[PDB]
Amino acid sequence: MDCDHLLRLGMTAKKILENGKGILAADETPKTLGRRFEKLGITNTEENRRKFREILFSTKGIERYIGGVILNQETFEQTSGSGVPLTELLKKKGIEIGIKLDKGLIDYKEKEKISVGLEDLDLRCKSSAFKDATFAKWRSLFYFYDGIPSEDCINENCSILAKYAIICQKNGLVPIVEPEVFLEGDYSMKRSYEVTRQILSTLMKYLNYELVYIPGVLIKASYVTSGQLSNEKYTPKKVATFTLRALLSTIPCGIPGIVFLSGGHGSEDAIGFLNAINMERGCRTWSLSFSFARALTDGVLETWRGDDSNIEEAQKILLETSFKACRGAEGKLWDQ
Amino acid sequence: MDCDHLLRLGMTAKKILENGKGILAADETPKTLGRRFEKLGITNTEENRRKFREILFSTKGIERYIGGVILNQETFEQTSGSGVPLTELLKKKGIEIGIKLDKGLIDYKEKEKISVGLEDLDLRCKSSAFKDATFAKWRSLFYFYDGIPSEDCINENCSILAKYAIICQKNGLVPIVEPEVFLEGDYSMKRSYEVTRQILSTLMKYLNYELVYIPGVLIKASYVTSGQLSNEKYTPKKVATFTLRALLSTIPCGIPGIVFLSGGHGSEDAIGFLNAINMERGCRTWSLSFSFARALTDGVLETWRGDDSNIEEAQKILLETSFKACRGAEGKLWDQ
Ligand SMILES: [Cl-]
Ligand SMILES: [Cl-]
């Protein structure tokens, strides 16, 4: 953690988000991807998981819009049908390679979760498997119910995210910290707004207590909305207003970027909220961009359907959806 | 706290710091001012306290450099030798009038302090005495010793500052929150840096939990330095680097300004640190300005000495020192 080392982290963080670019999240575990596959009639074979990632990474022109890709650990060991390591597809395109490093969630208190995997995190960061990686991702999830998220759960998850962040940085990796506010729940938008302010301000506390290099951290955040079980409606403008207010209230000038997660929102909504937040006035130093899994790849899966003859059309949908995300990241989706 | 009400707070906060201006702190209690008087041979009469404030507020041209003045409660009841309410001197000059609203400190745990006065704060904000005030100030103080500041003390003081802040805002006053890191102590600059990051990030947590309107809050902060009993040396550049890093790591884009306290540092040092921090590169949305008591008024007291025939020269020193502070607030002290 000398001057040069820190500057490298900051440069990586900015490179990922240059020129309206964002992040393609492709880090689903076999179990998470398998559920997605099964809804659409695709067998959850390793081969189909490998091919899916090949389809994504080999999309021609995707590097104009995508500055980094978050890989699942198993994908680092996989090759294209033509023999080339899947990581090489991305490296040749100049796209930064990331690694998801959490080991999922376990129960905490009543009805809440913490994320796990810190105990061997430093050893894992040093794995030869991930030698080409320059950034990482770790997810916590905040369930909402009557008196929840509890303060204990906010504190513990923020502590875990911060401890992961410092270990990443000490290993030369830019950490993405992902404090996801779970969409499946019954809560008002005002409640999401207030809890988002609690979570993000607390996350910044723990990052500071762990003496994380703030210019070398990316925050992957949920949009501020009401819960999916709420009867409450909202529009892109309202999501933009509330989300940007929460961020302006909580995120220090030194953070280089916020990258939104799609979170169960539609592709259309996720991109529209991004565009809307980037048209909002309100001085800020950080980029507002994207780290989408479903918003970018649901259409690819729905087009592909496990049939090689649908691959070209699936790649076209990725490229077009990635274009729109990038235009949204600059607030230009209505233009040209 | 409707839209218009909030916008007024933000406008006040920006007006105070327009055009490189800063804050003249004149809010010393009779006891605090009296100690200063007695060192220099001036009797601690109410008359001498009144005259001192008249000397300050009637300084010709001071409004070019001073955007607001923090008054002590007793000063709102006082008049010039010519009969004019002291607040009228400032109002006629277009300078914002502030009120210090804390009731001082009491013991907390072992060797620490909390600030007090919340219980009647709302009633006091509504006093007809303060009807011309548009902003307020509240001070906490953090002593440093082996395992101190304790986490309990950081949390409690930040909670108190945030509770004061929200009450101010609900009464139409912009709160200045002052988490002063006490200079008298034995600690390294690295320790001050790390603890400053703890305190400021925690203060932002509590401001967010109290749902304070962040664009309507000013932070009056200590420079990051080693303690006065430390043998450790530092220069303006090092103070600038460490202080700006701490601020970039902790203070959200929405905060309109940071105003440094002089804190026992010399006038010369306090202004020099300000200039140095304003020459630092590093993108930020907030102003870096001043809220000085001693740095601006020690020279006035030392020149005046309680003799009317020294008043003109005392006012000249205030104006010249205020000029330098303002040039420092723009990073221009070496120029023109
Ligand atoms: Cl997953
Ligand atoms: Cl005082």
Residue numbers in the entry:
A (entry chain A), B (entry chain A): 2 to 337
Passage from the reporting paper:
The glycolytic enzyme fructose bisphosphate aldolase (EC 4.1.2.13) catalyzes the aldol cleavage of fructose 1,6-bisphosphate to dihydroxyacetone phosphate and glyceraldehyde 3-phosphate. It also catalyzes the reverse reaction. The hallmark of a class I aldolase is the presence of an active-site lysine residue which forms a Schiff base with the substrate. Fructose bisphosphate aldolase from E. cuniculi (EcFBPA) adopts the TIM-barrel fold typical of aldolases.
